[PDB]
Design a protein around this ligand. Structure first.
Ligand SMILES: [Mg+2]
Ligand code: NA
Ligand code: NA
Lengths: 211, 210
């Protein structure tokens, strides 16, 4: 959840907001080790419930999200239903565990390609066009993340937009991402330069991947 | 002496506007069929399966014309080559269907088949079903027959399935056409066409448009 003023500005300037619980357990092995554990349900529940209680009156918030990259655990299903029960006014989405689980109203993959399948075991990323028409699938598809804009990037962006416009159930996505996470450091003369992972003696680190 | 007056055009022509040569005549076989007074007038074969296709029930509905008699029976027998695999015998008289009773002139036979050999374009397994109309003590009145392929065609969850597996149709539309005989078909040409189709990896044909 963001700084409270963010929602007020989005209400007033006009932007649709996906408000997202502060839950990410990416580093766990496997990713849902905590989120499938009933011992972590209380802690997870507070990150979802207290977000809803705070932000539910904002018109800019149109979709609730259960967090990011925490696999798919039984705790997600429980909290999905909790939101559906207390706030029927907003769809709930969640990407973890293959982007189309029972804890999401919207197929919301990250970095699924337009035409090319990436058939990873258990959590494949289908071509977005193909994904829509998988047997039994009826939901809209909106990428929670696509077109990773790292450095000299955004090649193939037009291919996404051509597809979004042609397919009714392809309703767009959220680019990753808005602003480089570089930090300012100073040289011996006090001149500022843009720093990234590893520049603060921080180790281990993932270098320029924050930008 | 038979006399047949064939009209090139009729009100039927309004429903026969296929994109093809418009021809006319007695262009398929003519034949004479002798049936007894007490006769098999119709029969339907159905095959139903369990979830893994390791068991089947062949259901054969048989209809008769002629005078109804208690001594009448139908036997449906099912053959794999020269081996009889199953058989059923019953007198006429279907189950009750409404307030006025059932079909006295019909009977349904049900044969169990364990581990049926399944029909597909990949392996065209066939059984022979013989439908015998006869008396209780075994005097044959008449027999009809057909080739039986054990297969289930269904649409589930948006997929067309044959025997529980999703088909990939490698098909072609095929008109009945010979450059010398027009729309008259012969066995040699039919067989030539089927061999060429299968040799070129086709598994399906659409009877365009009749
Ligand atoms: Mg036409
Ligand atoms: Na669209
Ligand atoms: Na990053």
């Amino acid at each position: 959840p963001n700084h409270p003023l963010w929602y007020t500005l989005c209400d007033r300037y006009g932007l649709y907001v996906v408000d997202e619980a502060n839950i990410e357990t990416h580093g766990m092995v496997p990713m849902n080790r905590l989120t499938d554990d009933p011992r972590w349900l209380p802690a997870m529940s507070e990150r979802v419930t207290r977000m809803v209680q705070r932000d539910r009156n904002h018109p800019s918030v149109i979709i609730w999200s259960l967090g990011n990259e925490s696999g798919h655990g039984a705790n997600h299903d429980a909290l999905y239903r909790w939101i559906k029960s207390v706030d029927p006014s907003r769809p709930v989405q969640y990407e973890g565990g293959g982007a189309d689980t029972t804890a999401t109203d919207i197929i919301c993959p990250m970095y699924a390609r337009v035409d090319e399948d990436q058939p990873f075991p258990a959590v494949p990323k289908w071509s977005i066009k193909k994904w829509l028409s998988l047997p039994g699938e009826t939901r809209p598809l909106i990428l929670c993340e696509y077109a990773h804009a790292m450095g000299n990037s955004l090649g193939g962006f037009a291919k996404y937009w051509q597809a979004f416009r042609q397919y009714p159930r392809l309703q767009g996505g959220f680019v990753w991402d808005w602003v480089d996470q570089s930090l300012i450091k100073y040289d011996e003369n006090g001149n500022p330069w843009s720093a990234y992972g590893g520049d603060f003696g921080d180790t281990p680190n993932d270098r320029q991947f924050c930008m | 002496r038979l006399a047949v007056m064939v009209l090139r055009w009729s009100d039927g022509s309004y429903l026969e506007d296929q994109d093809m040569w418009r021809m006319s005549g007695i262009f398929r076989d003519v034949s004479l069929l002798h049936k007894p007074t007490t006769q098999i007038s119709d029969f339907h074969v159905a095959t139903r399966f369990n979830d893994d296709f390791s068991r089947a029930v062949l259901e054969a509905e048989v209809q008769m014309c002629g005078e109804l008699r208690d001594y009448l029976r139908v036997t449906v027998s099912l053959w794999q080559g020269e081996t009889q695999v199953a058989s059923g015998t019953a007198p006429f008289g279907g189950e009750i269907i409404d307030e006025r009773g059932g079909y006295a002139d019909r009977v349904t036979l049900r044969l169990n088949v364990e581990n049926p050999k399944l029909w597909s374009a990949e392996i065209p397994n066939l059984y022979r079903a013989v439908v015998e109309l006869h008396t209780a003590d075994g005097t044959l009145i008449e027999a009809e027959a057909c080739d039986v392929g054990f297969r289930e065609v269904r649409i589930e969850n948006g997929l067309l399935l044959l025997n529980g597996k999703p088909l990939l149709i490698r098909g072609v539309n095929r008109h009945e056409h010979h450059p010398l005989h027009g729309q008259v078909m012969d066995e040699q040409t039919m067989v030539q066409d089927i061999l060429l189709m299968k040799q070129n990896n086709f598994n399906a044909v659409r009877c365009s448009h009749y």
